[PDB]
Amino acid sequence: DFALSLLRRNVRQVQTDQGHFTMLGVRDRLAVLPRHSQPGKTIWIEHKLVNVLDAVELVDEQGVNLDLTLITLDTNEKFRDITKFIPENISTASDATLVINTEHMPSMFVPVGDVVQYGFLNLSGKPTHRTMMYNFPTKAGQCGGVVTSVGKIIGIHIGGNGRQGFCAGLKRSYFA
Ligand SMILES: CCOC(=O)CC[C@H](C[C@@H]1CCNC1=O)NC(=O)[C@@H](CC(=O)[C@@H](NC(=O)c1cc(C)on1)C(C)C)Cc1ccc(F)cc1
Secondary structure: OHHHHHHHHHEEEEEEOOEEEEEEEEEEOEEEEEHHHOOOOEEEEOOEEEEEEEEEEOOOOOOOOOOEEEEEEOOOOOEOOOHHHOOOOOOOEEEEEEEEOOOOOOOEEEEEEEEEEEEEEEEOOEEEEEEEEEOOOOOOOOOOOEEEEOOEEEEEEEEEOOOOEEEEEOOHHHHO
C-alpha cells in the first residue's frame, strides 16, 4: 500500500547521459539520484526535458562519498513531502521492497528481503560509505531504486555484484 502510493506520487523515470535511473522526489522541487547518474543542467524526466536549478553531491560530517546527489528541479509540480517517512537514523530492515521505475523497467517492485548494515563499499573502484546490503540479484538499470520497508524509505539502490545488491542509506537530516 505504502510502496504503491510512493511509486505513484514520488518515484519518477529519468535519463541522464549516463543512462536510465529511478528518481525519488523528496519534497517540493527537491529530489535525490544516485551520484553516478551525474545529472547535468538538463535532465530527461518522463519524456520531458527539465532544467536543473542546482545539484549538490551529498556530504555529511565525515566528508566522504555517500553516492547520492540532491537536485532541485525547475518544475511547476511539487512532490508530496515524504521526509517524515525517512527515518532519523539509517535503518536496517526485514522484508524490504525495492521500487524501480524507469522507461525500461517501469513500475516494478522487487522483494529483496533483509537489508543489513554494510558501510564501506568499493563500487567499481570508487569508495562509498553508509551502504546497506541485500542478498538479491539486482541488475544494471535498477540504480536509483527506492528501498522501502514497513512504511519507511530507507535507501537508494547504487550497486551489486550479481548475487548481492547495495543501497545508499537514507536519513531524514540529509534533506533538511
Ligand atoms: C552503467 C550501468 O549503470 C547502472 O546500471 C547503475 C545501476 C547498477 C546496478 C548494479 C549493476 C550490477 N548489479 C547491480 O545492482 N550499478 C552499477 O553498475 C555500478 C557499479 C557496480 O555496481 C559494480 N559492483 C561492485 O563494485 C560491487 C562490490 C561489491 C561488494 O558488490 N558489488 C560493478 C562491478 C557491477 C555503477 C557505479 C560505477 C562507479 C561508481 F563509483 C559507482 C557506481
